[PDB]
Design a protein around this ligand. Structure first.
Ligand SMILES: CN(C)CC(=O)NC[C@@]1(C(=O)Nc2cncc3ccccc23)CCOc2ccc(Cl)cc21
Ligand SMILES: CN(C)CC(=O)NC[C@@]1(C(=O)Nc2cncc3ccccc23)CCOc2ccc(Cl)cc21
Lengths: 301, 305
């Protein structure tokens, strides 16, 4: 019993964190096999932040301009290349702690663990989700760039995020491990803003199923709803549309609790209309949307 | 920016998790140097748990009855002893991944990271607080026993908790690494209940300071209060008493934000008597009490391990 926001154990990623220094800039790198991945903005100066020409800046760099430190050991850079917004520094040593890994690009609503790092040293691990507006609500200070987001499948680390920047509202933007930004963001200091964020409806429903599995039933009602009527209501509360894919995804939790998805949707509509009235669900006074249907099943069963 | 419930990096503890099997029971063990620590209830059967005489049950066990597995490698048990509610299995191999460590007993209100394990394999890490009623609001399924709670100070792991059981309300009970239970709990299948819990006041204040550091100031007011008047109001809402020690520990956050501790106490008093009024603090509609003043400073300044 109990339901917590739970991150994956970070050990497999900790053994991959290194410090990358280029001139006066120091950030984090991910050392896998003989390659160190890091945000390409590490090559930028104060004059190259508004409109950097990364191809032009990178061509002017030599391998010895990149200082890579793994623990108290300096790694030797023997090559450098850019893949989208990620810099790939070929090093002369394969990381002996390289876990079984994959690079995966995730979709909004997906969750992942973040290992926040400074100077190539892990500071903390937390859980978050890719917001529908493609930002993440992280906890990151200056120097956290290059910190990664991941999930673990048995003994395989799926890297899904690398931190690049903080937007004016305090939310965070980054890329997958192929350097493709999530969202319409660019690695420039040009005015950028996160779009209006919405609540991840399928995740709220999964969390209501987690509450039922944990014995919390006060919010259930005798009603059901059509999928279209639910979306019409949910949209008015800035909730993401619930698709038939989402309804299908919730099938196993629906079977386990005996509450049809559209029956749970009617409970969610009622919660949106009434609020909680001094009550809580799984220790929260707000509807939680950073647990996926997969997270709920994993944590409960 | 941002404020998250953040656990310590779990790597140093992951390299210590092993699976301990005794008869039909399988749970987790903590392998440090040449000793595997685990809950002594691993030696119990269904009948035993009802009224166990652990000295009597343990004397009947031989070293070969305990199957210890570290990864896909079986460790050899060469001795066994009991220290309070923890079983200590001496093994022939010292854990090469043993970090710098200490065993520490924490106080209620102190937070720690839990590495939840099943079959000696880490499944997740979460941060929690030792409740004033000595339970933890954890997330554990059957097989999680032996999972540990820890903090990190520089490169030293301080082990503070080992999971033993789940109470009828779904909250959790366990011991320090010396086998002493936190709270009035015993390791037996008998009627036990968590006492009425209270809110960790010093932690709520620390979290209000974290909200201010992050730009959330709506709850601040022009008022201050005496420590005694605040404690009188705190008693009413089932909040823990705020001591002068707590006021002192909040000193650095008070200096950083420019809000005296008793000034923040007057904000907390108003939040208690009047509520949030539809507003949230750090994305929460409830006052969060599972961040200590040290956690807030560590997160808002970026301390690394
Ligand atoms: C040193 N400087 C030349 C480069 C640099 O490190 N820039 C990093 C920077 C950025 O967003 N950094 C940060 C990241 N996460 C959390 C933060 C919390 C507080 C302050 C900064 C934070 C700052 C300037 O705005 C941009 C704009 C585009 C991009 Cl991709 C990055 C950035
Ligand atoms: C029965 N026994 C030989 C094996 C066993 O399962 N013992 C463990 C047990 C216990 O509390 N287990 C659990 C721990 N954490 C989370 C759980 C979630 C769901 C179900 C069980 C959970 C079972 C119940 O009763 C007691 C009572 C005293 C103590 Cl110290 C332990 C136990």
């Amino acid at each position: 019993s109990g339901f917590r926001k739970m991150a994956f154990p970070s050990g497999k990623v900790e053994g991959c964190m290194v410090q990358v220094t280029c001139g006066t800039t120091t950030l984090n790198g991910l050392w896998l096999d003989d390659v160190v991945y890091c945000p390409r903005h590490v090559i930028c100066t104060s004059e190259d932040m508004l409109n950097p020409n990364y191809e032009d800046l990178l061509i002017r760099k030599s391998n010895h301009n990149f200082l890579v430190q793994a623990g108290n050991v300096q790694l030797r850079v023997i090559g450098h290349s850019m893949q989208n917004c990620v810099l790939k520094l070929k090093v002369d040593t394969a990381n002996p702690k390289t876990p079984k890994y994959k690079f995966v690009r995730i979709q909004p609503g997906q969750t992942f663990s973040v290992l926040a790092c400074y100077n190539g040293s892990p500071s903390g691990v937390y859980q978050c989700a890719m917001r529908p507006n493609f930002t993440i609500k992280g906890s990151f200070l200056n120097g956290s760039c290059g910190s990664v987001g991941f999930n673990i499948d048995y003994d395989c680390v799926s890297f899904c995020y690398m931190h690049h920047m903080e937007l004016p509202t305090g939310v965070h933007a980054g890329t997958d491990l192929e350097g493709n930004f999530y969202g319409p963001f660019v690695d420039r200091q040009t005015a950028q803003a996160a779009g209006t964020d919405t609540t991840i409806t399928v995740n709220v429903l999964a969390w209501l199923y987690a509450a039922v599995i944990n014995g919390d039933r006060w919010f259930l009602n005798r009603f059901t709803t059509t999928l279209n009527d639910f979306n019409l209501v949910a949209m008015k509360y800035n909730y993401e549309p619930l698709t038939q894919d989402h309804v299908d995804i919730l099938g196993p939790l629906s079977a386990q609790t005996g509450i049809a998805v559209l029956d749970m949707c009617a409970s969610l509509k009622e919660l949106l209309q009434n609020g909680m009235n001094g009550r809580t669900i799984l220790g929260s006074a707000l509807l939680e949307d950073e647990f996926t249907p997969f997270d709920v099943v994993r944590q409960c069963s």
